[PDB]
């Protein structure tokens, strides 16, 4: 009556439900009114999830981008790998799936399988033409992310089997940035193709990755040290966040507005969420005794 | 335009949107009499509208917010600030988060400004019984007094319980009830009112879906139940509905289908409690009932830049 309450009331409740419309035919009874529909992407990206290989076919047959991906950039394949859903991975590839499609972090389905240890999949992908030399945001290739012996082996003997130049790949990005930085500084015309997604700039890539040389060379082209990306970040917000110490020093030596604010309201010190935090304050104490 | 009442929503709504851009947790100051006004004015509008709202697409439905003001502002910055778009929140505006006060006030304010384009349903955290235990009480007494709290209580007690869009989408914070056979049971519900540990209204605010369940099952929440996909189907097949939209549960991508897209769960509080790392959701329903999902990734979840090409 104080506890029987919750328990018995609910019981002497389920009871009434018995004779109630628990009998109302429990299927779909597809009325002539399925007026509500969901976006193709939402419906496709999910049909694969559960595993209704069957419906995906019709969805594709009707016209749905197989390489559709959620907010994080994960394709119907990325997820498939992450779920050791072998059958689907193949279904996807055999139906047109882009086997090398990167996620919003430079992770291709091979990275996924690698990082997760789903070797049988890593084997399938690698055989179906997966790119073992693909590098992501942190400069890692599936091999770097393989933290299981069996996996590392397969990838190791795969990079060496194909003669893939690993460092070549990690350096590729920075490398290019240098060329471009030189061309802009030299000629005197900046031709920076702001990146379609993040709205960030080369100044930001330099800072986040800690590419000291490209940065110094970039500032010398007189590129606004205080440019903000669509999220409202400063080339300092990055160098600090990902903790690229020397990247920050450079940014400061050029009077970077340290008081910059995030579109959500954060300082370079604020979202500098990672370790170093105190060091900046030191450089800050210097961005005054000399100005 | 000129005249009218005591509460100047224009003044409040404004002051509330002013921290847009300021660091999170930055407070929007105001009079307890302005807060108390907000409560009484909205409370009066709720009571003037049905308990079972009969709404009309197009509109953007939202799930829990739990005092995460900074994020709520972000939701409006995505779907557009009212009256730009029609809104329908599914409950749980307070508790847990840091700014329940800022969050609810703005919601109520907008409820007053555009009373026919803005709607708030009651979440399970809209009962003195529990938001007393989950921070809203403390956040009130911290900046005001227990009485201001009781005024909110009198307000929440008047919130609508459900909504039906274009006669095809049933919405409610929690879910179903083994007592809900005819909408009329909802309509004949006294208001103001509290939430019992058991009953039809308690189920609507508490119950949950569970694939591992067939028919009706018990709930690990210690209250109400859980329902299987088969109960969802019986329900829809009964009132001839297409979808059951709800929140109440944290879902990784802001939304989550159930019983073969017959039911959907929306959660609009990105990185809830800082514990989980979920995104916030928001369902857009146009005049055709073409439902799409606008996602809100956890803030401060910056993706490391790439040259691009
Ligand atoms: Mn809830
Ligand atoms: Mn909740």
Coordinates of C-alpha atoms and ligand atoms in Angstrom, one line a residue:
Chain A
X1 CA 0.0 0.0 0.0
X2 CA 3.2 2.1 0.1
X3 CA 5.3 -0.2 -2.0
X4 CA 2.6 -2.7 -3.1
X5 CA 1.5 0.6 -4.6
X6 CA 3.9 0.8 -7.5
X7 CA 4.1 -2.9 -7.9
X8 CA 0.5 -3.9 -7.5
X9 CA -1.1 -0.9 -9.1
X10 CA 1.0 -1.6 -12.2
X11 CA 0.0 -5.2 -12.0
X12 CA -3.7 -4.7 -11.4
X13 CA -3.1 -2.4 -14.4
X14 CA -1.5 -4.8 -16.9
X15 CA -4.6 -6.9 -16.1
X16 CA -7.0 -4.5 -17.7
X17 CA -4.8 -4.4 -20.7
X18 CA -5.5 -8.1 -21.3
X19 CA -9.1 -7.8 -22.4
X20 CA -8.2 -4.4 -23.8
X21 CA -7.1 -3.9 -27.4
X22 CA -4.1 -6.1 -27.0
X23 CA -6.2 -8.1 -29.5
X24 CA -6.1 -5.3 -32.1
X25 CA -4.4 -7.1 -34.9
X26 CA -0.5 -6.5 -34.2
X27 CA 1.1 -6.3 -37.7
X28 CA 1.5 -3.3 -40.0
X29 CA -2.0 -3.4 -41.6
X30 CA -0.6 -0.9 -44.1
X31 CA -3.5 1.5 -44.2
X32 CA -4.0 3.5 -47.3
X33 CA -2.3 6.2 -45.4
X34 CA 1.5 5.8 -45.0
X35 CA 1.7 9.6 -45.4
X36 CA 4.7 10.0 -43.2
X37 CA 8.1 9.4 -44.7
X38 CA 11.8 9.8 -43.7
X39 CA 14.7 11.3 -45.7
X40 CA 16.4 8.8 -48.0
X41 CA 19.7 9.2 -46.2
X42 CA 18.2 8.5 -42.8
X43 CA 16.3 5.5 -44.2
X44 CA 19.2 4.1 -46.2
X45 CA 22.0 4.7 -43.6
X46 CA 19.8 2.8 -41.2
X47 CA 18.4 -0.1 -43.4
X48 CA 22.0 -1.2 -43.6
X49 CA 22.5 -0.9 -39.9
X50 CA 19.9 -3.4 -38.8
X51 CA 21.1 -5.7 -41.7
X52 CA 18.1 -5.8 -44.0
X53 CA 20.4 -6.4 -46.9
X54 CA 17.2 -7.0 -48.8
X55 CA 15.6 -3.5 -48.3
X56 CA 18.9 -1.8 -49.1
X57 CA 18.7 -3.4 -52.6
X58 CA 15.2 -1.9 -53.2
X59 CA 16.4 1.4 -51.7
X60 CA 19.3 1.3 -54.1
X61 CA 17.2 0.0 -57.0
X62 CA 14.9 3.0 -56.3
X63 CA 17.9 5.5 -56.3
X64 CA 19.9 6.0 -53.2
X65 CA 23.6 7.1 -53.0
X66 CA 25.4 4.0 -51.6
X67 CA 28.1 6.4 -50.4
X68 CA 25.8 8.4 -48.2
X69 CA 27.2 9.2 -44.7
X70 CA 26.1 10.6 -41.4
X71 CA 27.4 13.8 -39.7
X72 CA 30.7 12.1 -38.8
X73 CA 31.2 11.1 -42.5
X74 CA 30.8 7.4 -41.8
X75 CA 29.4 5.6 -44.9
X76 CA 27.2 2.6 -44.9
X77 CA 30.5 0.7 -45.2
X78 CA 32.4 2.3 -42.3
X79 CA 29.7 1.3 -39.9
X80 CA 29.5 -2.2 -41.5
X81 CA 33.2 -2.7 -40.6
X82 CA 32.9 -1.3 -37.1
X83 CA 30.2 -3.9 -36.5
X84 CA 32.3 -6.8 -37.9
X85 CA 29.2 -7.3 -40.1
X86 CA 31.2 -9.2 -42.7
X87 CA 28.2 -10.0 -45.0
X88 CA 27.2 -6.4 -45.3
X89 CA 30.7 -5.1 -46.0
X90 CA 30.8 -7.4 -49.0
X91 CA 27.2 -6.6 -50.0
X92 CA 28.1 -2.9 -49.9
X93 CA 31.3 -3.4 -52.0
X94 CA 29.6 -5.8 -54.4
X95 CA 26.9 -3.2 -54.9
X96 CA 29.2 -0.2 -55.7
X97 CA 30.4 0.9 -52.3
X98 CA 33.4 3.2 -52.5
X99 CA 36.0 1.1 -50.7
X100 CA 38.3 4.0 -49.9
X101 CA 35.7 6.6 -48.8
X102 CA 37.2 8.7 -45.9
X103 CA 35.3 9.7 -42.8
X104 CA 35.3 13.3 -41.5
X105 CA 38.6 12.3 -39.8
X106 CA 40.6 10.8 -42.7
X107 CA 39.6 7.3 -41.6
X108 CA 38.8 4.9 -44.5
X109 CA 36.9 1.6 -43.8
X110 CA 40.3 0.0 -43.7
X111 CA 41.3 2.2 -40.7
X112 CA 38.2 1.1 -39.0
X113 CA 38.7 -2.7 -39.4
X114 CA 42.3 -2.2 -38.6
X115 CA 41.7 -0.3 -35.4
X116 CA 39.1 -2.8 -34.3
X117 CA 40.9 -6.0 -35.1
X118 CA 38.3 -7.4 -37.5
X119 CA 41.0 -9.1 -39.5
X120 CA 38.7 -11.2 -41.7
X121 CA 37.4 -7.9 -42.9
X122 CA 40.7 -6.2 -43.2
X123 CA 41.6 -9.1 -45.4
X124 CA 38.6 -8.7 -47.6
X125 CA 39.0 -4.9 -48.0
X126 CA 42.7 -5.1 -48.7
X127 CA 42.0 -7.7 -51.4
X128 CA 39.1 -5.7 -52.9
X129 CA 41.6 -2.8 -53.5
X130 CA 41.6 -1.1 -50.1
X131 CA 44.3 1.6 -49.8
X132 CA 46.8 0.6 -47.1
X133 CA 48.7 3.8 -47.4
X134 CA 45.8 6.2 -46.6
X135 CA 46.7 8.7 -43.9
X136 CA 44.2 10.3 -41.5
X137 CA 44.0 13.5 -39.4
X138 CA 46.7 12.2 -37.0
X139 CA 48.9 11.0 -39.8
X140 CA 48.2 7.4 -39.3
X141 CA 47.6 4.6 -41.8
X142 CA 45.7 1.4 -40.9
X143 CA 49.1 -0.1 -40.0
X144 CA 49.8 2.5 -37.4
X145 CA 46.4 1.9 -35.9
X146 CA 46.7 -1.9 -35.8
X147 CA 47.1 -2.8 -32.2
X148 CA 46.7 -6.6 -32.5
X149 CA 49.7 -8.7 -33.7
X150 CA 47.7 -10.7 -36.3
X151 CA 46.5 -7.4 -37.7
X152 CA 49.8 -5.6 -37.7
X153 CA 51.4 -8.6 -39.5
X154 CA 48.9 -8.6 -42.3
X155 CA 49.2 -4.9 -42.8
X156 CA 53.0 -4.8 -42.4
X157 CA 53.4 -7.6 -44.9
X158 CA 51.0 -5.7 -47.1
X159 CA 52.7 -2.4 -47.1
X160 CA 56.1 -4.2 -47.8
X161 CA 54.4 -6.5 -50.3
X162 CA 53.1 -3.5 -52.3
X163 CA 56.2 -1.4 -51.6
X164 CA 54.2 1.5 -50.2
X165 CA 56.3 4.4 -49.0
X166 CA 54.8 5.1 -45.6
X167 CA 56.6 8.3 -44.4
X168 CA 56.0 9.5 -48.0
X169 CA 52.3 9.5 -47.0
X170 CA 52.6 11.2 -43.6
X171 CA 54.7 13.9 -45.2
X172 CA 52.6 14.3 -48.3
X173 CA 50.3 16.9 -46.7
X174 CA 52.9 19.1 -45.0
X175 CA 55.0 18.7 -48.1
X176 CA 52.3 20.2 -50.4
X177 CA 51.5 23.0 -47.9
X178 CA 55.1 24.1 -48.2
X179 CA 55.0 24.3 -52.0
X180 CA 51.8 26.3 -52.0
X181 CA 53.1 28.6 -49.2
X182 CA 56.2 29.2 -51.2
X183 CA 54.2 30.0 -54.4
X184 CA 51.9 32.5 -52.5
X185 CA 54.7 34.2 -50.6
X186 CA 56.9 34.4 -53.7
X187 CA 54.5 35.6 -56.3
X188 CA 52.6 37.7 -53.7
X189 CA 49.1 36.3 -54.4
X190 CA 47.5 34.0 -51.8
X191 CA 45.4 31.3 -53.4
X192 CA 44.1 29.5 -50.4
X193 CA 41.1 27.3 -51.2
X194 CA 39.3 27.4 -47.9
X195 CA 38.2 23.9 -47.0
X196 CA 34.5 23.3 -47.9
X197 CA 33.5 21.7 -44.6
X198 CA 35.1 23.3 -41.5
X199 CA 35.5 26.6 -43.2
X200 CA 39.1 26.6 -41.9
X201 CA 42.2 27.8 -43.6
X202 CA 45.8 26.6 -44.4
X203 CA 46.8 28.7 -41.5
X204 CA 44.6 26.5 -39.3
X205 CA 46.0 23.2 -40.8
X206 CA 49.5 24.5 -40.2
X207 CA 48.7 25.2 -36.6
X208 CA 46.8 22.1 -35.8
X209 CA 49.4 19.8 -37.3
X210 CA 52.3 21.8 -36.0
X211 CA 54.0 22.5 -39.3
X212 CA 56.3 25.2 -38.1
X213 CA 57.9 25.8 -41.5
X214 CA 54.7 26.2 -43.5
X215 CA 53.3 28.5 -40.8
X216 CA 56.3 30.8 -40.6
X217 CA 56.2 30.9 -44.4
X218 CA 52.4 31.6 -44.3
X219 CA 52.6 34.5 -41.9
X220 CA 55.3 36.0 -44.1
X221 CA 52.7 36.1 -46.9
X222 CA 50.8 38.4 -44.6
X223 CA 47.9 36.0 -43.9
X224 CA 45.5 37.2 -41.2
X225 CA 46.8 35.5 -38.1
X226 CA 43.4 36.0 -36.6
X227 CA 41.2 34.3 -39.2
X228 CA 38.3 32.3 -37.8
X229 CA 36.7 29.2 -39.4
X230 CA 33.0 28.6 -39.5
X231 CA 33.2 27.4 -35.9
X232 CA 34.9 30.6 -34.9
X233 CA 38.4 29.2 -34.2
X234 CA 41.7 31.1 -34.4
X235 CA 44.9 29.6 -35.9
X236 CA 45.7 29.8 -32.2
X237 CA 42.6 27.9 -31.0
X238 CA 44.0 24.9 -32.9
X239 CA 47.8 25.0 -32.2
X240 CA 46.7 25.2 -28.6
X241 CA 43.9 22.7 -28.6
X242 CA 46.0 19.9 -30.2
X243 CA 48.9 21.2 -28.1
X244 CA 51.4 22.3 -30.7
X245 CA 53.7 24.3 -28.4
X246 CA 56.1 25.9 -30.9
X247 CA 53.1 26.6 -33.1
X248 CA 51.7 28.9 -30.4
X249 CA 55.0 30.7 -30.0
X250 CA 55.0 31.5 -33.7
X251 CA 51.4 32.7 -33.5
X252 CA 52.3 35.0 -30.6
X253 CA 55.5 36.5 -32.0
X254 CA 53.2 37.9 -34.7
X255 CA 50.7 39.6 -32.3
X256 CA 48.0 37.0 -32.7
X257 CA 44.9 38.3 -30.9
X258 CA 45.1 35.9 -28.0
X259 CA 41.8 37.3 -26.7
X260 CA 39.9 35.8 -29.7
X261 CA 36.6 34.1 -28.9
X262 CA 34.9 30.9 -30.1
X263 CA 31.6 31.2 -31.8
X264 CA 30.4 29.4 -28.7
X265 CA 32.5 31.7 -26.6
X266 CA 35.9 30.2 -25.8
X267 CA 39.4 31.6 -25.7
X268 CA 42.5 30.1 -27.2
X269 CA 43.3 29.3 -23.6
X270 CA 39.7 27.9 -23.2
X271 CA 39.4 25.2 -25.8
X272 CA 43.1 24.6 -25.4
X273 CA 41.6 21.8 -23.4
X274 CA 44.9 19.9 -23.6
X275 CA 47.8 20.0 -21.1
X276 CA 50.1 22.9 -22.2
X277 CA 47.6 25.5 -21.0
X278 CA 50.0 27.2 -18.6
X279 CA 52.7 27.7 -21.2
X280 CA 50.6 30.0 -23.2
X281 CA 50.1 32.3 -20.2
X282 CA 53.9 32.6 -20.1
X283 CA 54.2 33.6 -23.8
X284 CA 51.3 35.9 -23.0
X285 CA 53.3 37.5 -20.2
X286 CA 55.8 38.2 -23.0
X287 CA 53.3 39.5 -25.6
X288 CA 53.3 42.6 -23.4
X289 CA 56.9 43.2 -22.2
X290 CA 57.6 43.6 -25.9
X291 CA 55.0 45.5 -28.0
Chain B
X1 CA 3.1 46.7 -30.8
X2 CA 2.0 49.0 -28.0
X3 CA 0.2 48.4 -24.7
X4 CA -0.8 45.1 -22.9
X5 CA 0.4 43.4 -19.8
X6 CA 3.2 43.6 -17.2
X7 CA 5.7 41.1 -18.6
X8 CA 7.7 42.4 -21.5
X9 CA 8.9 39.2 -23.2
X10 CA 10.6 41.3 -25.8
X11 CA 12.9 42.6 -23.1
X12 CA 13.5 39.2 -21.6
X13 CA 13.8 37.1 -24.8
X14 CA 16.3 39.7 -25.9
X15 CA 18.4 39.7 -22.7
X16 CA 18.3 35.9 -22.9
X17 CA 19.7 35.8 -26.4
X18 CA 22.4 38.2 -25.5
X19 CA 24.8 35.6 -24.1
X20 CA 24.9 34.1 -27.6
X21 CA 28.6 34.2 -28.1
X22 CA 29.6 34.6 -24.5
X23 CA 31.2 31.7 -22.6
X24 CA 28.8 29.0 -21.6
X25 CA 27.5 29.3 -18.1
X26 CA 27.4 33.0 -18.4
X27 CA 24.2 34.1 -16.6
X28 CA 21.3 36.1 -18.0
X29 CA 20.2 38.2 -15.0
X30 CA 16.5 38.9 -14.2
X31 CA 13.8 39.7 -11.7
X32 CA 12.1 36.9 -9.8
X33 CA 9.0 38.9 -10.6
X34 CA 9.9 38.5 -14.3
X35 CA 10.5 34.8 -13.7
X36 CA 7.3 34.5 -11.7
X37 CA 5.6 36.5 -14.4
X38 CA 6.8 34.1 -17.1
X39 CA 5.4 31.2 -15.1
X40 CA 2.0 32.7 -14.6
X41 CA 1.6 34.0 -18.1
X42 CA 2.6 30.7 -19.8
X43 CA 0.7 28.7 -17.2
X44 CA -2.4 30.6 -18.3
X45 CA -1.7 29.9 -21.9
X46 CA -1.3 26.2 -21.3
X47 CA -4.6 26.0 -19.5
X48 CA -6.1 27.8 -22.4
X49 CA -5.0 25.2 -24.9
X50 CA -5.9 21.5 -24.9
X51 CA -3.9 18.9 -22.9
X52 CA -3.7 16.8 -26.1
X53 CA -2.4 19.4 -28.6
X54 CA -3.6 19.0 -32.1
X55 CA -0.8 20.5 -34.1
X56 CA 0.0 21.0 -37.8
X57 CA 3.1 20.5 -39.9
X58 CA 5.4 22.0 -40.8
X59 CA 7.3 22.0 -37.5
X60 CA 10.5 21.0 -35.8
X61 CA 10.2 18.5 -32.9
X62 CA 12.9 18.4 -30.2
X63 CA 13.8 16.0 -27.3
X64 CA 15.3 16.5 -23.9
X65 CA 17.4 19.6 -23.2
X66 CA 18.1 19.3 -19.5
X67 CA 19.2 22.8 -18.7
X68 CA 21.8 22.8 -21.4
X69 CA 21.1 26.4 -22.4
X70 CA 24.3 26.9 -24.6
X71 CA 23.0 23.9 -26.7
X72 CA 19.4 25.0 -26.8
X73 CA 20.6 28.3 -28.3
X74 CA 22.5 26.2 -30.8
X75 CA 19.3 24.3 -31.6
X76 CA 17.5 27.5 -32.5
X77 CA 20.5 28.7 -34.5
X78 CA 20.1 25.6 -36.6
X79 CA 16.4 25.3 -37.1
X80 CA 16.0 29.1 -36.8
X81 CA 14.8 31.2 -33.9
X82 CA 11.1 31.5 -33.4
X83 CA 8.9 32.5 -35.1
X84 CA 11.1 31.5 -38.0
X85 CA 9.9 27.9 -37.6
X86 CA 7.3 26.0 -35.6
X87 CA 8.6 24.2 -32.6
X88 CA 7.4 21.3 -30.4
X89 CA 9.6 20.3 -27.5
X90 CA 9.0 16.9 -26.0
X91 CA 10.0 17.7 -22.4
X92 CA 12.8 17.5 -19.8
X93 CA 14.0 21.1 -19.9
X94 CA 15.5 21.2 -16.4
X95 CA 17.7 19.1 -14.1
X96 CA 21.3 17.8 -14.8
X97 CA 22.4 20.6 -17.0
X98 CA 24.0 23.9 -15.8
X99 CA 21.3 26.4 -16.9
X100 CA 17.8 25.1 -16.3
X101 CA 16.7 28.7 -15.5
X102 CA 18.0 30.3 -18.6
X103 CA 16.7 27.4 -20.6
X104 CA 13.1 27.1 -19.3
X105 CA 12.6 30.9 -19.2
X106 CA 13.5 31.3 -22.8
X107 CA 11.2 28.4 -23.7
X108 CA 8.3 29.8 -21.7
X109 CA 9.0 33.4 -23.1
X110 CA 8.8 32.1 -26.6
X111 CA 5.7 30.2 -25.6
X112 CA 4.1 33.5 -24.7
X113 CA 5.4 35.5 -27.7
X114 CA 4.2 33.0 -30.3
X115 CA 1.6 30.9 -28.4
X116 CA 0.4 29.3 -31.6
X117 CA 3.7 28.4 -33.2
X118 CA 5.5 27.4 -30.1
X119 CA 4.8 24.4 -27.9
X120 CA 6.1 22.6 -24.8
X121 CA 5.1 19.2 -23.6
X122 CA 5.7 17.9 -20.1
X123 CA 8.7 15.7 -19.5
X124 CA 9.1 13.5 -16.4
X125 CA 11.4 16.2 -15.0
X126 CA 8.4 18.6 -14.8
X127 CA 7.3 17.2 -11.5
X128 CA 8.4 18.7 -8.2
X129 CA 8.8 15.1 -7.1
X130 CA 12.0 14.6 -9.1
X131 CA 13.5 18.0 -10.3
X132 CA 13.8 18.5 -6.5
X133 CA 16.3 15.7 -6.5
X134 CA 18.1 16.6 -9.8
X135 CA 19.4 20.1 -9.4
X136 CA 16.6 22.4 -10.6
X137 CA 15.5 22.9 -7.0
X138 CA 19.1 23.9 -6.0
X139 CA 19.5 26.1 -9.1
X140 CA 16.4 27.9 -8.1
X141 CA 17.1 28.3 -4.4
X142 CA 20.6 29.2 -5.4
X143 CA 19.6 32.2 -7.4
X144 CA 16.2 32.9 -5.8
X145 CA 14.0 31.0 -3.3
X146 CA 12.0 27.9 -2.8
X147 CA 8.8 29.9 -3.6
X148 CA 10.0 30.8 -7.0
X149 CA 10.5 27.1 -7.4
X150 CA 7.0 26.4 -6.3
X151 CA 5.7 28.8 -8.9
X152 CA 7.5 26.8 -11.6
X153 CA 5.9 23.8 -10.1
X154 CA 2.5 25.3 -10.5
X155 CA 3.4 26.0 -14.1
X156 CA 4.8 22.6 -15.1
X157 CA 1.7 21.1 -13.5
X158 CA -0.3 22.8 -16.4
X159 CA 1.8 21.6 -19.3
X160 CA 0.2 19.6 -22.1
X161 CA 0.8 15.9 -22.1
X162 CA 0.8 14.9 -25.8
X163 CA 0.4 16.2 -29.3
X164 CA -0.8 14.8 -32.6
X165 CA 0.6 16.2 -35.9
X166 CA -1.6 16.1 -39.0
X167 CA -3.4 13.3 -37.4
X168 CA -0.5 10.9 -38.0
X169 CA 2.2 11.5 -35.5
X170 CA 1.6 10.9 -31.8
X171 CA 4.1 12.7 -29.5
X172 CA 4.9 12.5 -25.8
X173 CA 8.0 12.6 -23.6
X174 CA 8.0 9.0 -22.4
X175 CA 5.8 6.6 -24.3
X176 CA 2.8 4.3 -24.2
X177 CA 0.5 3.0 -21.4
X178 CA -1.5 -0.2 -21.0
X179 CA -4.3 2.2 -20.0
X180 CA -4.2 4.3 -23.2
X181 CA -6.9 2.9 -25.5
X182 CA -8.7 6.2 -26.4
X183 CA -7.2 9.7 -26.7
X184 CA -10.2 10.8 -24.8
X185 CA -8.6 9.5 -21.6
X186 CA -5.9 12.1 -22.1
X187 CA -8.4 14.9 -22.8
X188 CA -10.4 14.3 -19.7
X189 CA -7.3 15.0 -17.6
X190 CA -7.6 17.5 -14.8
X191 CA -5.0 20.3 -14.8
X192 CA -3.2 21.6 -12.8
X193 CA -2.0 18.2 -11.7
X194 CA 0.9 16.2 -10.4
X195 CA 2.4 12.9 -11.6
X196 CA 1.6 9.7 -9.7
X197 CA 4.0 6.7 -9.4
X198 CA 1.5 4.8 -11.5
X199 CA -1.2 5.7 -14.0
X200 CA -1.8 6.7 -17.6
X201 CA -0.2 10.1 -17.2
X202 CA 2.7 8.5 -15.4
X203 CA 3.3 6.1 -18.2
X204 CA 3.2 8.8 -20.9
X205 CA 5.9 10.6 -19.0
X206 CA 8.0 7.5 -18.1
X207 CA 7.6 4.3 -20.1
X208 CA 10.3 3.1 -22.6
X209 CA 10.6 1.0 -25.8
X210 CA 12.5 -2.3 -25.5
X211 CA 13.1 -4.7 -28.5
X212 CA 14.0 -7.5 -26.0
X213 CA 10.4 -7.2 -24.9
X214 CA 7.1 -8.5 -26.3
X215 CA 4.0 -6.9 -25.1
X216 CA 4.5 -5.2 -21.8
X217 CA 7.6 -5.5 -19.7
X218 CA 8.9 -4.0 -16.4
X219 CA 11.2 -1.0 -16.5
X220 CA 14.7 -0.7 -15.0
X221 CA 13.8 2.9 -14.0
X222 CA 11.8 1.4 -11.1
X223 CA 8.6 3.1 -12.4
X224 CA 6.2 2.6 -15.2
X225 CA 7.0 -0.1 -17.8
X226 CA 8.5 -0.8 -21.2
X227 CA 6.8 -1.8 -24.4
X228 CA 7.6 -4.1 -27.3
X229 CA 7.4 -3.3 -30.9
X230 CA 4.1 -5.2 -31.0
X231 CA 2.5 -2.8 -28.6
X232 CA 3.6 0.1 -30.8
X233 CA 2.0 -1.6 -33.8
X234 CA -1.3 -2.3 -31.9
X235 CA -1.4 1.3 -30.9
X236 CA -0.8 2.8 -34.3
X237 CA -3.0 0.2 -36.1
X238 CA -5.7 1.2 -33.5
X239 CA -5.8 5.0 -33.8
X240 CA -4.6 4.8 -37.4
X241 CA -1.3 6.6 -36.8
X242 CA 1.9 6.6 -38.7
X243 CA 4.5 7.4 -36.1
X244 CA 5.1 7.7 -32.3
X245 CA 7.6 10.5 -31.7
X246 CA 9.2 10.7 -28.2
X247 CA 12.4 11.5 -26.2
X248 CA 13.2 10.5 -22.6
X249 CA 16.2 8.3 -23.6
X250 CA 19.7 9.2 -24.7
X251 CA 20.5 8.0 -28.2
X252 CA 23.9 8.3 -29.8
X253 CA 22.9 10.1 -33.0
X254 CA 20.1 12.4 -31.6
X255 CA 17.5 10.1 -33.0
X256 CA 16.8 6.4 -33.2
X257 CA 14.2 4.2 -34.9
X258 CA 12.2 1.4 -33.4
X259 CA 9.7 -1.3 -34.5
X260 CA 10.7 -0.6 -38.1
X261 CA 10.6 3.2 -38.1
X262 CA 7.1 3.1 -36.5
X263 CA 8.6 4.9 -33.5
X264 CA 11.4 7.4 -33.1
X265 CA 13.3 8.7 -30.1
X266 CA 14.8 12.1 -30.1
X267 CA 17.3 13.5 -27.6
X268 CA 18.5 17.1 -28.1
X269 CA 21.1 17.4 -25.3
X270 CA 24.6 17.0 -26.9
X271 CA 27.1 15.1 -24.7
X272 CA 24.5 14.6 -22.0
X273 CA 25.9 15.2 -18.5
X274 CA 29.4 15.2 -20.0
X275 CA 29.1 11.5 -19.2
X276 CA 27.9 10.2 -22.6
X277 CA 29.2 11.5 -26.0
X278 CA 25.9 11.6 -27.8
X279 CA 24.8 14.1 -30.5
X280 CA 21.6 16.2 -30.2
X281 CA 18.7 15.5 -32.5
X282 CA 15.9 17.6 -34.1
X283 CA 13.2 16.3 -36.5
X284 CA 11.9 18.5 -39.3
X285 CA 8.4 17.8 -40.4
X286 CA 7.3 19.7 -43.5
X287 CA 3.7 20.1 -44.8
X288 CA 4.1 16.7 -46.5
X289 CA 5.2 14.9 -43.4
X290 CA 8.6 14.4 -45.0
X291 CA 10.6 13.8 -41.8
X292 CA 14.3 14.6 -41.8
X293 CA 16.9 14.9 -39.0
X294 CA 19.1 17.9 -38.2
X295 CA 21.9 16.7 -36.0
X296 CA 23.9 18.7 -33.4
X297 CA 27.3 17.2 -32.7
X298 CA 28.7 17.7 -29.2
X299 CA 30.2 21.2 -29.0
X300 CA 34.0 21.5 -28.5
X301 CA 34.3 18.3 -30.6
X302 CA 36.5 20.0 -33.1
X303 CA 37.5 17.8 -36.1
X304 CA 41.3 18.3 -36.9
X305 CA 41.7 20.3 -40.2
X306 CA 42.8 18.9 -43.5
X307 CA 44.2 20.8 -46.5
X308 CA 41.4 19.6 -48.9
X309 CA 42.7 18.5 -52.2
Ligands
LIG1 MN1 13.0 11.7 -19.4
LIG2 MN1 15.6 12.6 -19.5

